[PDB]
Design a protein around this nucleic acid. Structure first.
Ligand SMILES: [Mg+2]
Ligand SMILES: [Zn+2]
Ligand SMILES: [Zn+2]
Lengths: 476, 1336
RNA sequence: GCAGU
């Protein structure tokens, strides 16, 4: 084969991509119905968990109080009109009535799949179902962490293949009555498990608490969890077939954006993200072909990606739209009048102020590379003509050290008290400067007196006796 | 501060420990306000504050609170300079292979995993699976799988085995492997393997694994899980003044990496299909690999100019990388530059410096002297005073430059005299005034050349400029010990015109009281400068005690030599000026003064010579007119005779007597004969046209023609140009080299017509293009030599060794090319040189051979002196000062600390731009002597040499050889051994076109397996009178006698097998194919006659000799000393075997028989004797004949190139490079040591290890030295900074990283890179202190 | 790129 002959990742993408055959009009229908069957059966699988039923019904009474809108509660009902939802959620309430107490445990096992297939006709939205499935994932984490507590609370104490201890556990679910025959092996594992037989205490009951707050047994809600996993992997399997089949559409779209700032593969990967968004946001009951929907989503994803990550100094998407409108308008104006339009006529073909056009035109430039050769001279570049402006000139460093010396001497020519007042009030020889109150607490003297001391020393140093060297530190 | 630089691989923990935060977003800066964006590539919170002591929200603004992490924005309050030091990092969502440890061959991931690079590139490009753990399954650990094969394995084995793809799989393979276990397993299967190729693969893999286990490295660190981010001030995004920005390509590459990485994290969260996440992992891998090394894997990423982005690896490598462009040479403050002009008024230590250049170069000196002297109250006041250029700052500037040298430099700095110090004399121009005498050192003419001026700031720098580099210390050259501050065109012409004589000149014949009266007469116009006159001359000679003793004598002189005597210092003789002084006579004058009197009189003499030469060339009025180019009046008739001759050769061609080839050759030779005739007639007219009258009688003298006076001086030009001015300019070549058959019969005094001028441009532009294209080759050779030899410093005074090379004069065939004097001058002797009369040591053992000792060596006739060389120095890490010899620039034994390797490399590569792109007849009297002799007498009375490498020298009546010829095997010698000859007579003759096999001893024919028709084809021909026979070819034989080789052997008419005297093995002649025999069975031939006949430069040459490259078809040298026999045949290679009877005999060779072999099956050979002939390979010389043999070979073959162009270079400089070439060794026997057989170790390491082992009784390792090229030896140093700095930075850095290397900064380049004192020169004492106080 | 050495 062609494996190992190329190094271009574009060619490897096209090679791995062309090995998936396209879909017909009816193939997309079949795949979308597989997706829909997976997602509504997994929504029935979380409907097997009746705390979700309680949540549905309490937000249904909040819908009767209109906490949020019905469109992002329900998308409709299969065989928006709100009067279906009210009375047929009341119907589900009567169904919950006939299942709440009709257990008197062999006769209750029909009303639950009757609940499922009367829940069949329900549609659910993504976000509140995301709340429901995060609650279900809390349920999952609790189930798995308790079963793994059972797993590695005993095997960190013992050395034995634990299938002998799982054979007695499944079905008990209430107490340690399955521990009475653990020691009967009399091989030292259940001897060491003696020292564990107590500290499982507040574990082994507490899950069994919520077991009947959600009504159903821990083993059969583990069955519900695995059936949920089967249904959700069934949905995600068919979401994979629809993406991998329409991967040519992403390339056919993304070839129109090629030199607009991103690489080819970056464009097709952002379009792939858009295509996955189109797939999990596509519903086939509108009777429209999937490509016309995925094209909108892929165009959105690719243009948003170019707006976000194609520039070094990133400008927002609104300024990107503004610059694109500006370039289009100036393009048409150049075509109609044969010259580049002035910003004071480009601003009147648009309706923005002229200074806004000026700042937009100042913004739209991309940074030069510092390895740009100057006049095609390769040994030189742009990078070695750019100086460091933040540096200090060593003449200014010498000026600063000389000013430090001169100031130190002309303040050594004073009384130590007032010279330290000046060194203390400015930041001289000290990490911080101090206001008059600070030094008032320090010098044991009221504020305005040491203010007058500072003025005293300043008037003293203004004389041309000592200030002849300092004046040369002033500019001309 | 620090003593070594350790390189290693970076753990992800090490990468997270450097970093000050993770770069989560690709944001560089905000577009409206240019403050840097949070969590971005420029992040003030991560990389530090963008302003000094100011957080980015401005809440904290002063260093009152420094080191404070602000809470409104997380920016520390500290200097902004920390943005040049603070790195960041990127957490890659997928493990990514490092491109350097995947792609720089040999692949370290491939070499470590025992996996081909195609398999690894297929696993980490998601094109195949790989089984990272086999388990209880037939799948092994390196077994790659396709997708469907992996599906089938999952069908058959399930979730038991583990297989993966991508760099996660490679990382799991590098992580799961055990290094010490696999190393010892490879050592086991290397002890049991005899396949040399598998042993090579196994030993390189073993050295890789043991280099991993000895260093702290782990293998899986070669797969990047964390990626470092360079500090943002080193890849800056800076606003240009025009509003636009300017960024480095590193920001684009980092931004690409972060975009693909965040998208990969997105896809991994969205649970995307495997096609998309595989494509994204591939894109992240290729973006990281384009960040590290762009273009190393496939197509280079090009951004927004359609020019490839400069990656991290491109920053540090190449001619524009950090190592060569910013670390080994750099732009420099306190440096100016201007055009150079003559200034002939200067002294040798002075330059002329413009006042406006010296006022800027010395600005802080003037600021400090204005502050000090009270003339300025401040440095701002002094700055304003210098800016206004008051009259007092010029007095200050005269004060600050007084004894302050400056360095003047003319790039290209080909050698160390291209930088010399000078004291500045402030001139008012804008051009530097460079002393004339130093121009030849700089290769500087004043036709627009510019020179840079540098100011030495510190007292050490000023004292080195004054003591080491000042132009008065530089009057000898370091390449050869000859003067380089030497007079030149105007000076030589002035001194030549002054020191000539004319026959009837004005004032001839008078007698003068001395040189002062001669100057009086000349200046008074009472006598001409050439009047032959009698001057009372007082001259002083240095007596044996050392002082100057006088002598006064009337010298027959001219007036001008009397005048010139006034400037000659005292200890020189009058014979030094009593001659017409050309360029060489003046150079000999200066060399004599330097040897006799010393440096301080010589600089004064050189300046005085320059002044008086300039003066009397000015007074000469020496001018070139058009009548100076006298065309010989025989030119037209010589040319007409040659035209008639080529017309007769043309009619001989038209009549078919001669083919166009011989016609072309004869026309060329009868045009070159006419050219030589015209040149001889021109020069005979031009050199002696002065016939002038002495007392009426006409008398010819040497011509005072200006063109001849310039040529004969050596001032400018040679007869090769005078011949084109006044002769003809002869045959020109085509662009390919074939000379055109009709010459330019014109010269430049006459015109060249359109066709002659075009034909001359053919060769003119070829010369110009070679000049413009060989400087880039000689500079590259000089660079390679410098980077091989830089670390050789003279580090000792004596190693006490007794080895050394036997220096002899270079006698190429009939004539000597270098005497013993200029070959041993300056060496130290290695053994006691004794007179030809024995038992009295002429020169003692350890003596430096200065000029007096060489005069003693040529008083007697000693012709071979064993001297000490650096190739035989016992000093490790350097060279003793005795094995080097003299410092050629100073003239005494070399000091400890001299950097002789850089001097040797510059001295070799400086003349690189002056390079390009049968019977013997004894010439003079002497006693012949042959060596390597096996000799008999022929039937007639000749002397017959039955030996291959017998060589015929001419020992003269004193013992020294004056010619050395090569006499072939079987050549008949007319004389004996030790017989006098006549000058020009023939001694030896042979058959040039065929190789004869000669009779060992007189005897009778036996055709042993000489089968007629199977091994013999009978031929017939009329003009021979006797039928001939041929022994058959390989491709003409039937089945048969190629397997049983036909032989012709000796018997008697007795029937007794008479054999060689001394042995009883059967004498044979195994005649090979392509031979001729015209002799029948049973014929009688005596010893000494044939029995059968068998028919048969420039700069790239120096570069090939130093790169030690094997030639096309090298001479096959005999490995060990034994006897010749033959095995298998006709597999393309006849099978030679050389068997010594006195040991383990069989050594067999695979000589391909398309090479004409040069030894018979009967004789005994030694190591080095050529079994076949050809250009010898130097590795074979080093292996079989020794170290001194390849040393002699390389220095002879390099000096052969350098002596054609007339370039003098002392042999020390080539022996230094040879020592640095044979610097490694291979262990053949590991001994009681820590080495392995077949590994290449530093030779000094194994030498000192053997020494310290033998000190404790255990026997050390035994080794075989290696000859590497200058590139392969520069790159194989134990210091990775020098090797990574030289070239191939990527290979050197990956080898050093995976080896966990350490570099102790011991040579010169590693101390120039880090800004330290070099360990040579005035920084040698500092390093001795540093290594004697950091050792204990 | 174009020149100068
Ligand atoms: Mg020049
Ligand atoms: Zn802040
Ligand atoms: Zn030595």
């Amino acid at each position: 084969s062609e494996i190992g002959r190329t190094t271009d990742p574009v060619r490897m993408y096209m090679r791995e991509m062309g090995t998936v055959e396209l879909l017909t009009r009816e193939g997309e229908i079949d795949i979308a119905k597989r997706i829909e069957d997976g997602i509504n059966q997994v929504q029935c699988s979380v409907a097997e968990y009746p705390e979700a039923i309680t949540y549905l019904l309490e937000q249904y009474d909040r819908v009767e109080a209109e906490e949020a809108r019905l469109s992002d509660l329900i998308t409709g009902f299969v065989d928006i009109d709100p009067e279906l939802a009210r009375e047929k959620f009341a119907e589900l309430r009567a169904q919950y009535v006939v299942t709440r107490d009709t257990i008197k445990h062999a006769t209750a096992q029909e009303e639950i799949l009757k609940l499922s297939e009367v829940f069949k006709q329900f549609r659910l939205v993504p976000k509140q179902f995301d709340y429901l499935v995060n609650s279900m994932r809390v349920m999952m984490d609790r189930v798995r962490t308790q079963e793994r507590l059972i797993m590695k609370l005993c095997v960190e104490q013992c050395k034995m293949p634990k299938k002998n201890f799982i054979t007695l556990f499944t079905g008990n679910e209430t107490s340690d009555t399955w521990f009475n025959a653990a020691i009967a092996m009399n091989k030292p594992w259940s001897e060491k498990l003696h020292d564990v037989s107590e500290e499982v205490h507040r574990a082994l009951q507490k899950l069994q608490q919520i077991e009947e707050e959600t009504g159903l047994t821990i083993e059969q809600v583990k069955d519900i969890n695995r059936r949920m996993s089967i249904g959700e992997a069934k949905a995600r399997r068919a979401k994979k077939e629809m993406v991998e089949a329409n991967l040519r559409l992403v390339i056919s779209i993304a070839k129109k954006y090629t030199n607009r700032g991103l690489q080819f593969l970056d464009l097709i990967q952002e379009g792939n993200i858009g295509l996955m968004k189109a797939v999990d946001k596509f519903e086939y009951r509108r009777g429209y072909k999937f490509s016309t929907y995925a094209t909108w989503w892929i165009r959105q994803a690719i243009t948003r990606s170019i707006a976000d990550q194609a520039r070094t100094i990133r400008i927002p998407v609104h300024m990107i739209e503004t610059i694109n409108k500006l370039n289009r308008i100036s393009r048409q104006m150049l075509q109609e009048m044969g010259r580049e339009p002035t910003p004071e006529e480009l601003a009147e073909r648009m309706l923005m102020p002229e200074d806004k056009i000026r700042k937009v035109l100042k913004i739209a430039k991309e940074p030069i590379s510092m390895e740009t050769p100057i006049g095609d001279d390769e040994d030189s570049h742009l990078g070695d003509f750019i100086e460091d402006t933040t540096l200090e000139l060593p003449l200014d460093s010498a000026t600063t050290e000389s000013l430090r010396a001169a100031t130190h001497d002309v303040l050594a020519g004073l009384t130590a008290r007032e010279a330290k007042v000046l060194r203390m009030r400015f930041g001289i020889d000290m990490n911080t400067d101090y206001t008059l109150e600070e030094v008032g607490k320090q010098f044991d003297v009221t504020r305005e007196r040491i203010r007058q001391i500072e003025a005293k020393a300043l008037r003293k140093l203004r004389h041309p006796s000592r200030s002849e060297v300092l004046r040369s530190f002033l500019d001309d | 501060e620090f003593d070594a630089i350790k390189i290693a691989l970076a753990s992800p923990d090490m990468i997270r420990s450097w970093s000050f935060g993770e770069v989560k977003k690709p944001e560089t800066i905000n577009y409206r306000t240019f403050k840097p964006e949070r969590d971005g590539l420029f992040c003030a919170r991560i990389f530090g504050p963008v302003k000094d002591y100011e957080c980015l929200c401005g809440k904290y603004k002063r260093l009152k609170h420094r080191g404070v992490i602000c809470e409104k924005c997380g920016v520390e309050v500290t200097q902004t300079k920390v943005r040049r030091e603070r790195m960041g990092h990127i957490e890659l969502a997928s493990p990514t292979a490092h491109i350097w440890f995947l792609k720089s061959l040999p692949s370290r991931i491939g070499l470590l995993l025992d996996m081909p690079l195609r398999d690894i590139e297929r696993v980490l490009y998601f094109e195949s699976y790989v089984v990272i753990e086999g388990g209880m399954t037939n799948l092994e650990r390196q077994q790659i799988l396709t997708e469907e094969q992996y599906l089938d394995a999952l069908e058959e084995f399930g979730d038991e085995f583990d297989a993966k793809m991508g760099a996660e799989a490679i990382q799991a393979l590098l992580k799961s492997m055990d290094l010490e276990q696999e190393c010892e397993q490879l050592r086991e299967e290397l002890n049991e393997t005899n396949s040399e190729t598998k042993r090579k693969k196994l030993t390189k893999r073993i050295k890789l694994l043991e280099a991993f286990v000895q260093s702290g490295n782990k293998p899986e660190w070669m797969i990047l899980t964390v990626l470092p981010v360079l500090p943002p001030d080193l890849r800056p995004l800076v606003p240009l003044d025009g509003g636009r920005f300017a960024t480095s390509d590193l920001n684009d590459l980092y931004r690409r990496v972060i975009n693909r990485n965040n998208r990969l994290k997105r896809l991994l969260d969205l649970a995307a299909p495997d096609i998309i996440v595989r494509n994204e992992k591939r894109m992240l891998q290729e973006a990281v690999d384009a960040l590290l090394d762009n273009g190393r894997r496939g197509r280079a990423i090009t951004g927004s100019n359609k020019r490839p982005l400069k990656s991290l690896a491109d920053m540090i490598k190449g001619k524009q990388g950090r190592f060569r462009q910013n670390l080994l040479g750099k732009r420099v403050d306190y440096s100016g530059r201007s055009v150079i002009t003559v200034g002939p008024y200067l002294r040798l230590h002075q330059c002329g410096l413009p006042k406006k250049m010296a006022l800027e170069l010395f600005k802080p000196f003037i600021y400090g002297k204005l502050e000090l002297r009270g003339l300025a109250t401040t440095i701002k006041a002094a700055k304003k005073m210098v800016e206004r250029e008051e009259a007092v700052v010029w007095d200050i500037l005269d004060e600050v430059i007084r004894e302050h040298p400056v360095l003047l430099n003319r790039a290209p700095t080909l050698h160390r005299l291209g930088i010399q110090a000078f004291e500045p004399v402030l001139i008012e121009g804008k051009a530097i005034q460079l002393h004339p005498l130093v121009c030849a050192a700089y290769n500087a003419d004043f036709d627009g050349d510019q020179m840079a001026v540098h100011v030495p700031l510190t007292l050490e720098a000023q004292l080195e400029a004054r003591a080491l580099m000042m132009s008065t210390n530089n009057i000898l050259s370091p390449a050869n010990g000859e003067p380089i501050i030497v007079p030149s065109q105007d000076v030589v012409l002035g001194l030549y015109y002054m020191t000539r004589d004319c026959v009837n000149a004005k004032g001839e014949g008078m007698v003068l009281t001395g040189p002062k009266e001669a100057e009086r007469l000349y200046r008074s116009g009472l006598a001409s400068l050439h009047a032959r006159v009698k001057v009372r001359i007082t001259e002083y000679e240095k007596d044996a005690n050392g002082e100057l003793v006088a002598k006064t004598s009337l010298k027959d002189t001219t007036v001008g030599r009397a005048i010139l005597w006034m400037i000659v210092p005292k200890g020189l003789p009058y014979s030094i000026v009593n001659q017409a002084l050309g360029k060489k006579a003046i150079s000999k004058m200066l060399n004599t003064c330097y040897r006799i009197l010393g440096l301080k009189p010589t600089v004064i003499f050189a300046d005085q010579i320059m002044y008086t030469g300039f003066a009397y060339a000015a007074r000469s009025g020496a001018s070139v007119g058009i009548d100076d180019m006298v065309i010989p009046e025989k030119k037209h008739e010589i040319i007409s005779e040659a035209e008639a001759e080529v017309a007769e050769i043309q009619e001989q061609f038209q009549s078919g007597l001669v083919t166009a080839g011989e016609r072309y050759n004869k026309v060329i030779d009868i045009w070159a004969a006419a050219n030589d005739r015209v040149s001889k007639a021109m020069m005979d007219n031009l050199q002696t046209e002065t016939v002038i009258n002495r007392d009426g009688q006409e008398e010819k003298q040497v011509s005072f023609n200006s063109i001849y006076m310039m040529a004969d001086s050596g001032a400018r030009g040679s007869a090769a140009q005078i011949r084109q001015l006044a002769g003809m300019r002869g045959l020109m070549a085509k662009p390919d080299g074939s000379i055109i058959e009709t010459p330019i019969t014109a010269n430049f005094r006459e015109g060249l017509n359109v066709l002659q001028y075009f034909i001359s441009t053919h060769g003119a532009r070829k010369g110009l293009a070679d000049t413009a294209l060989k400087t880039a080759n000689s500079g590259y050779l000089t660079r390679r030599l410098v980077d091989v030899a830089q670390d050789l410093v003279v580090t000792e005074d004596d190693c006490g060794t007794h080895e050394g090379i036997m220096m002899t004069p270079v006698i190429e065939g009939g004539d000597v090319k270098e005497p013993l004097r200029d070959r041993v001058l300056g060496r130290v002797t290695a053994e006691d040189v004794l007179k030809p009369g024995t038992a009295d040591i002429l020169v003692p053992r350890n003596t430096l051979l200065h000029e007096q000792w060489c005069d003693l060596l040529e008083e007697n006739s000693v012709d071979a002196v064993k001297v000490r060389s650096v190739v035989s120095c016992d000093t490790d890490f350097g060279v003793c000062a005795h094995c080097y010899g003299r410092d050629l620039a100073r003239g005494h034994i070399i000091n400890k600390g001299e950097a002789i390797g850089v001097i040797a490399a510059q001295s070799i590569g400086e003349p690189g731009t002056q390079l390009t792109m049968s019977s013997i007849q004894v010439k003079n009297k002497g006693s012949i002597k042959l060596s390597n002799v096996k000799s008999v007498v022929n039937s007639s009375g000749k002397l017959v040499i039955t030996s291959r490498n017998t060589e015929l020298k001419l020992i003269d009546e004193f013992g020294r050889t004056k010619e050395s010829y090569k006499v072939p095997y079987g050549a008949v010698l007319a004389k004996g051994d030790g017989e006098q000859v006549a000058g020009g007579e023939t001694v030896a003759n042979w058959d040039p076109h065929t190789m004869p096999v000669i009779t060992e001893v007189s005897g009778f024919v036996r055709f042993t397996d000489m089968i007629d028709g199977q091994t013999i084809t009978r031929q017939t021909d009329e003009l021979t009178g006797l039928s001939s026979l041929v022994v058959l070819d390989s491709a003409e034989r039937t089945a048969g006698g190629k397997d049983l080789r036909p032989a012709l052997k000796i018997v008697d008419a007795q029937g007794n097998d008479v054999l060689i005297p001394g042995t009883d093995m059967p004498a044979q002649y195994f005649l090979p194919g392509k031979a001729i025999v015209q002799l029948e069975d049973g014929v009688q031939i005596s010893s000494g006659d044939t029995l059968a006949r068998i028919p048969q430069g420039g700069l790239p040459r120096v570069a090939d000799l130093f790169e030690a490259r094997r030639p096309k078809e090298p001479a096959i040298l005999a490995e060990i000393s034994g006897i010749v026999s033959f095995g298998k045949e006709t597999k393309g290679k006849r099978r030679l075997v050389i068997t010594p009877v006195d040991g383990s005999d069989p050594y067999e060779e695979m000589i391909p028989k398309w090479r004409q072999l040069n030894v018979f099956e009967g004789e005994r050979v030694e190591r080095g004797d050529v079994i076949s002939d050809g250009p010898e390979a130097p590795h074979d010389i080093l292996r079989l004949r020794g170290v001194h043999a390849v040393t002699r070979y390389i220095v002879n073959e390099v000096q052969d190139v350098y002596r054609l162009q007339g370039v003098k270079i002392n042999d020390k400089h080539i022996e230094v490079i040879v020592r640095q070439m044979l610097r490694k060794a291979t262990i053949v026997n590991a001994g009681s040591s820590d080495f392995l057989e077949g590994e290449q170790v530093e030779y000094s390491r194994v030498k000192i290890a053997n020494r310290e082992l033998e000190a404790n009784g255990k026997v050390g390792a035994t080794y075989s030295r290696d000859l590497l090229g200058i590139t392969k030896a520069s790159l194989a140093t134990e210091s990775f900074i020098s090797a990574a700095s030289f070239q191939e930075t990527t290979r050197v850095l990956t080898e050093a990283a995976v080896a966990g290397k350490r570099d102790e900064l011991r040579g010169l380049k590693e101390n120039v890179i880090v800004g330290r004192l070099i360990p040579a020169g005035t920084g040698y004492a500092y390093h001795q202190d540093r290594m004697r106080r950091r050792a204990a």
